[PDB]
Amino acid sequence: VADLKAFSKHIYNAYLKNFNMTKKKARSILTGAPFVIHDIETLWQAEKGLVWKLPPYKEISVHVFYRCQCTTVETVRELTEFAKSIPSFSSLFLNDQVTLLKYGVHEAIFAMLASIVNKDGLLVANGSGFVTREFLRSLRKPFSDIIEPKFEFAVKFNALELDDSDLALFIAAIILCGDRPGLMNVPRVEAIQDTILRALEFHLQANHPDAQYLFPKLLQKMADLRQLVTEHAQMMQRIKKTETETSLHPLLQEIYKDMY
């Protein structure tokens, strides 16, 4: 319908408004330049100005973990603003908005990760840096363990060849999940999500006319993301317990507090 077309483009513009790094920009950068971070000395150089311009850390692995936290916390703030633009999200009681974000932002974050990833690494600092996967693999347990599964997910996710207009609806659908623990107005949320998902099905058909089964494949990706984040949360809670000298940003603490 033309509502669904108008709805999709509204969500897309909210996405363009709230996330500076898009898949389109990242793909232009990746295909052809970013400074390559691939060891401790190029990380130092990157911090010295080439890429970037952090609680005290004692090892490279925790230092990288802290950069991870900086970026995800920023992306949580962007997603909160984005969600305010999803029709009827702001009509929910504030505590439901908080529950939806608490349980959805990291699913959305690890979906958006694929936009800035190739099989060899990811873009950092707004395209100006590229961190190699093989360097992240060089970090110690459990930081390498919490990183690599996200690459695996992301490279498979990129096989679907989504673009930003698809992703904007996908992320909105992730945030508006009616089965989050402790929601109050489950039917409200479900209805909003159903509007988003019908818009997504339509948009995918218009945008990828020759792609068969793309919509159910994306619904499956949503479930895979839930599982990915469940296991992520498990590793973050564990790191909190075992890695006493490693800091968690208080927003991430709150998100993982009593999660799953």
Residues engaged in binding ligand A1D86 (CB under 6 A): 37, 43, 64, 67-69, 71-72, 75, 109, 112-113, 116, 122, 124, 131, 146-147, 150-151, 236, 252
CB of 137 to ligand A1D86, least distance (A): 11
Binding-site size for a second copy (CB under 8 A) equals: 16
Minimum CB separation of residue 57 from a second copy in Å reads 22
Q: Least Å distance between CB 201 and a second copy?
A: 30
Helix (H) or strand (E) holding 117: strand 117-118
181 belongs to the binding site for a second copy (CB under 8 A):
no
Length of the chain: 260
173 binds, among ligand A1D86, a second copy, none (CB under 5 to 8 A by kind): none
233, 240 Cβ separation under 8 angstroms: no
Cβ-contact 77, 159 below 8 angstroms: no
| Residues in region 15-74 near a second copy by CB under 8 A | none
- Which residues contact residue 239 at a Cβ distance below 8 angstroms, ignoring those fewer than 6 apart? 142, 146, 246, 248
Residue placing its CB nearer to ligand A1D86 in the complex, 122 or 196: 122
Burial of residue 220 (CB within 10 Å: 0-12, 13-18, 19+) is exposed
Pairing state between β 117-118 and 35-37: unpaired
Of these partners, a second copy, ligand A1D86, none, which one is at the site of residue 97 (CB under 5 to 8 Å by kind)?
a second copy
Q: 117 has which bridge partners?
A: 122
Neighbouring CB atoms inside 10 A of 100's CB total 24
> How far is Cα 94 from Cα 147, in angstroms, rounded to an integer?
32
Among 1, 2, 33, 94, binds a second copy (CB under 8 A): 94
Interacting positions 95-114 with a second copy (CB under 8 A):
95, 97-98, 101-102
**Which residues in this chain contact a second copy in the complex, by CB under 8 A?**
80, 93-95, 97-98, 101-102, 182, 184-185, 250-251, 253-254, 257
